[PDB]
Design an enzyme around this catalytic site. Sequence first.
Site, PDB file in Angstrom:
ATOM      1  N   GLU A 139       0.888  -1.176   0.000  1.00  0.00           N
ATOM      2  CA  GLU A 139       0.000   0.000   0.000  1.00  0.00           C
ATOM      3  C   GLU A 139       0.918   1.217   0.000  1.00  0.00           C
ATOM      4  OE1 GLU A 139      -2.186   0.756   3.697  1.00  0.00           O
ATOM      5  OE2 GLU A 139      -3.844   1.625   2.532  1.00  0.00           O
ATOM      6  N   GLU A 241      -7.758  11.251   3.081  1.00  0.00           N
ATOM      7  CA  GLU A 241      -8.105  10.345   4.158  1.00  0.00           C
ATOM      8  C   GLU A 241      -8.232  11.157   5.440  1.00  0.00           C
ATOM      9  OE1 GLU A 241      -5.501   7.001   4.571  1.00  0.00           O
ATOM     10  OE2 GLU A 241      -6.592   6.178   6.266  1.00  0.00           O
TER      11      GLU A 241
END
Length: 273
Positions: A139, A241
């Site tokens: 990721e 985010e």
Amino acid sequence: QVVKPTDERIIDPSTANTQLTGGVCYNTTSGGNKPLAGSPYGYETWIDTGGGVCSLCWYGADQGGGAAFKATWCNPHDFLGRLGYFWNENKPYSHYENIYCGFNYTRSGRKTAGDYSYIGIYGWSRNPSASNSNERLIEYYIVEDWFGNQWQADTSPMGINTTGGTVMGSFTVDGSSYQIIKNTRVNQPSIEGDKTFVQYFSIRQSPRKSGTISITEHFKKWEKLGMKLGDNMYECKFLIEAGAGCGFFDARLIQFYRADNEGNILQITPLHH
């Protein structure tokens, strides 16, 4: 000596600051990538039904560089809104050549996105032939900006106390130093179910809300430090985010483009006086 592209379809991010309108909005979790009509891009939303109201609103194919969006969250429990290239066609990063994203957004202020938050480029890659099984799923984040928190200013770059892991190195690109960090996520949610995988971060030491990200330069530097991406890049998207808080992100520009080492455009959006 990669040549920076000078193609006139590239929008200068420094002055791309006109508020966009006419968004199409999504208020629930998308369940992975969802393609956008008349666009090379796809969006994804991760919105907890146990938290407050969140949304991602795409500004369409014909303005704001084609990938612009506005996001909102209120009491989210880790909201993620993202939009950009979706790949997942068994190719390494280098297949996509020199990837760039020009951007310009506004956002809510310090301490409006919880104890951790991220703005910039995001995705995953797969490397199944890696001998360390922890490194077969990756990721990644290139972090241009964040919302700080009660303890640290949004004008100060986050560190390993936020990301976890270990500082591997640094370099300078696009007008700032970037700290490179590797972290292992042990038995955590992923795109392949709950498992162990690694996270690569580039943290911009001078946070900013507009400019150009030379994405492939990060990928190259990570690989020199032994932080390999493997042979199947999943995606490459612009992300906001928010761990918590109540706030917004509103892009006037998000423009992805790709060019070869000569600087000739291979892909750009959008597309007489």
